[PDB]
tetrahydrodipicolinate n-succinyltransferase (Mycobacterium bovis), 822 residues
Amino acid sequence: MQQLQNVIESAFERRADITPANVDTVTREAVNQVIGLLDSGALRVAEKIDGQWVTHQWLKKAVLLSFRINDNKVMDGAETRYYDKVPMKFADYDEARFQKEGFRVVPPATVRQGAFIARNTVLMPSYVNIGAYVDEGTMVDTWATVGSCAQIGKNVHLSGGVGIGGVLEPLQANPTIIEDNCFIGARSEVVEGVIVEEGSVISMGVYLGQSTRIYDRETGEIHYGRVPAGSVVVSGNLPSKDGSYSLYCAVIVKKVDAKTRGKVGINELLRTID
Amino acid sequence: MQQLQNVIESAFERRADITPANVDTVTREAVNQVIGLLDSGALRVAEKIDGQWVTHQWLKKAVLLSFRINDNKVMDGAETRYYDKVPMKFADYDEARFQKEGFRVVPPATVRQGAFIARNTVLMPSYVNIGAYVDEGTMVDTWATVGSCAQIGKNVHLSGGVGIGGVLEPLQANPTIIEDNCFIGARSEVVEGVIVEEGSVISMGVYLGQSTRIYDRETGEIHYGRVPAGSVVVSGNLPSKDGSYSLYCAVIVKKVDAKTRGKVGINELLRTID
Amino acid sequence: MQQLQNVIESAFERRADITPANVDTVTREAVNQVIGLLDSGALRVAEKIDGQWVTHQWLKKAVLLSFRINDNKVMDGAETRYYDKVPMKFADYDEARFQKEGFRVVPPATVRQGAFIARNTVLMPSYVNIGAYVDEGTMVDTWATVGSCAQIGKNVHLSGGVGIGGVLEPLQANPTIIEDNCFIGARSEVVEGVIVEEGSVISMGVYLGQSTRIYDRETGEIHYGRVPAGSVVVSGNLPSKDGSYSLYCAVIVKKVDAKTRGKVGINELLRTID
Ligand SMILES: CC(C)(COP(=O)(O)OP(=O)(O)OC[C@H]1O[C@@H](n2cnc3c(N)ncnc32)[C@H](O)[C@@H]1OP(=O)(O)O)[C@@H](O)C(=O)NCCC(=O)NCCS
Ligand SMILES: CC(C)(COP(=O)(O)OP(=O)(O)OC[C@H]1O[C@@H](n2cnc3c(N)ncnc32)[C@H](O)[C@@H]1OP(=O)(O)O)[C@@H](O)C(=O)NCCC(=O)NCCS
Ligand SMILES: CC(C)(COP(=O)(O)OP(=O)(O)OC[C@H]1O[C@@H](n2cnc3c(N)ncnc32)[C@H](O)[C@@H]1OP(=O)(O)O)[C@@H](O)C(=O)NCCC(=O)NCCS
Ligand SMILES: N[C@@H](CCCCC(=O)O)C(=O)O
Ligand SMILES: N[C@@H](CCCCC(=O)O)C(=O)O
Ligand SMILES: N[C@@H](CCCCC(=O)O)C(=O)O
């Protein structure tokens, strides 16, 4: 959308000088529209095209800009209070809407406005930040976190305590992406724009960033920045040249098989009852 | 109880075809009774008998079935809203009851109905899922999670961010069990029906599943599926046949002693004041 | 303050015999004053003096004593209820106050009374326990935990799921300390009075306790208990004498540089708008 894009990219350049008071009504109404579109899935920060994920940098700008144009407000919890500038996604929903939207929200799961939640997903208690997109069939398990602008595929299982990197602090060039049908093992972390290709199974306690060597014991090939589709990755170490010590690395031990599929499947009985 | 068992096991077979509307009042009243019994500790998903832990598969069925027979309902948080089908355990408690029940619930700790919480336990902010059983004296520290049907012994310390595997998704044959007097180190995970025998101390960042080699450096013996009573386990790696790389494993470095006991004890002053 | 110190240290000696009912009004009024001072930053459990961090053991006593002198009370969450004895810090705040205090509290971030939160900090959903002190500019990211009495410097970034050890259970001699300008990587844990010196960058999945060997590959020097200022630490392993297996250790791979600074900076746009 050019009528929105334009205004957004104009303002971003004056980011540091914009405040909730000196901001003109145009930039305000706009930034707000672009956030409403992300909330709805009509726009998404990154998308795959011609087998390549592409980042719409300017949508990442509007996300950033919302923090310069909005002012904090007291939010009454019940036993405590909060003070923040990003509204709660579900604050206005009634049953009708939850009924039409088709997902399940387990207390005290929390989602910020500007994040897209797809039909048939289950959010156990966890956090979904602004601009993230969570596709169909996915479960975000206990204490997991879907970082700002992150892109999560359909039928994904983010295990308990899993963290998917955001792009706000520290600031990142690209969002983190988990393609369709992946299983991310408990307590694992995926950050810094790494891409986990479809059908991959990341074991527990695996940490993947741009500096992580993803080692393929079979080919001897060492990847960086992405997990090839259908891999099973687990933690290991690689030895120093002098065998003096070893440093952490991710090891692709094999390609997903029935033995693997046995342990990581989605439980349809927990999904939406048609 | 045969009058309950029977009905439950009948229905389970038609699991995929049962919905919150076509379910007959018998199966409904029953499933509901079996959940009320679990909530109360009168029944428990697994139990030790003749020095062997046994799983009552049919109680795991009722847990599963509750998701087919109940419909979602809007739950009003304060600043947001939720939409789910498993009631909150403590929603009806008054002080009298909390006073009689003898445990402490730190906001915003959350427990689902169908989980048993014993006297003198302390729940820091954390999650206890349906069907779990948490025994006397235990503390569930910050952001820890007690997975569906998991069995936690007396006087256990589940450190911050610790995750004890559930049995719902991915679906599991047996619950995860932590016997009496164990200390589970921060950010560690125990899943897939592994058993941690009494008096063991699992260090921080230890991940135990059925595929985890538990190596006893002293005996050279490699375990799978269980931690022998009184062990102290920490993370390590085992080398490839070609010394090319190494893969994660759990290492039993020693048997618990006073030096160890010094660092992992329970603080009675925090327990219930008699 | 001697008029407070005295009373506190008197009572501590009778800790096990004091209860919310047999405690005399003096010890009660006092313990309560010392907690109000910690809440305000007027007193702090540990402080650096002459380039040495010092622990005021007697302030740690008052923290402990508050659990013996206060009785539990029902706290009404919205969808559930809690039963605990430490009030919520922000329960009384209005916008005026939040406005004057200058920090941001993202729901459902929770802080106990007795903890000091400095100006310009951002608390994503996380936990700050009694007696902790969080200095200026710092962000406590999602599901992080600042343990009882822990001391966090200015401009620190505690990543998602990071745990900073408390001193309550298990009981500890000294608090855990993170000096100014440090970045603690996702899912990492720092406990047992370890000190992370200023400007250090701890990678993801690093676990530091008193038994952790911090290995400097360059000097060959092995530290214990502290991370030398300006280090970049990541997980590795050290080999057994027989190369039979290896055990976890922290490895100082280098001194912080621009490449590093690129990935861990604070995002000022998210801080308080002056
Ligand atoms: C990866 C995993 C699924 C095992 O899958 P699998 O296909 O059965 O793998 P296998 O048991 O055949 O092992 C394959 C190889 O990798 C190793 N392996 C598998 N999982 C491993 C793990 N967690 N740690 C170390 N090694 C592991 C095996 O030792 C084996 O090595 P080898 O070929 O040299 O002998 C299991 O390790 C896992 O991650 N489970 C997830 C638990 C979880 O996160 N639950 C969520 C609770 S919310
Ligand atoms: C396991 C632990 C308790 C140490 O216990 P300990 O009995 O004092 O163990 P020691 O210091 O004697 O070390 C025993 C051996 O294991 C190693 N060891 C112990 N803990 C280790 C750890 N965390 N990482 C690596 N090695 C460790 C030591 O290097 C030593 O090896 P060695 O025999 O080859 O020299 C400590 O490591 C730990 O896990 N603390 C828990 C912290 C925690 O989770 N706090 C909770 C905050 S909510
Ligand atoms: C430490 C980190 C910042 C990399 O910093 P860096 O200065 O760019 O480090 P480099 O990429 O130059 O690597 C330095 C050395 O350490 C290793 N290294 C760096 N980070 C590593 C990691 N996470 N795992 C393993 N090795 C790592 C490199 O392999 C390299 O080893 P070498 O010198 O033998 O080749 C990055 O690893 C990291 O921790 N990012 C934090 C992500 C995070 O927690 N995000 C928060 C989301 S809430
Ligand atoms: N590491 C997180 C920090 C988000 C901060 C959001 C906020 O200030 O409200 C991310 O990049 O998503
Ligand atoms: N991994 C978790 C998932 C629980 C889902 C519960 C729900 O759908 O409400 C467990 O097996 O306990
Ligand atoms: N490991 C945590 C336990 C805190 C318990 C607080 C409570 O009982 O209320 C700490 O030492 O800070």
Observations:
- The pocket of (2S)-2-aminoheptanedioic acid (ligand 6) is lined by residues B 106, 122, 124, 141, 270; C 129, 147-148, 166-169 (CB under 6 Å).
- The helical segments of chain B are 2-13, 25-40, 57-69, 95-101, 258-264.
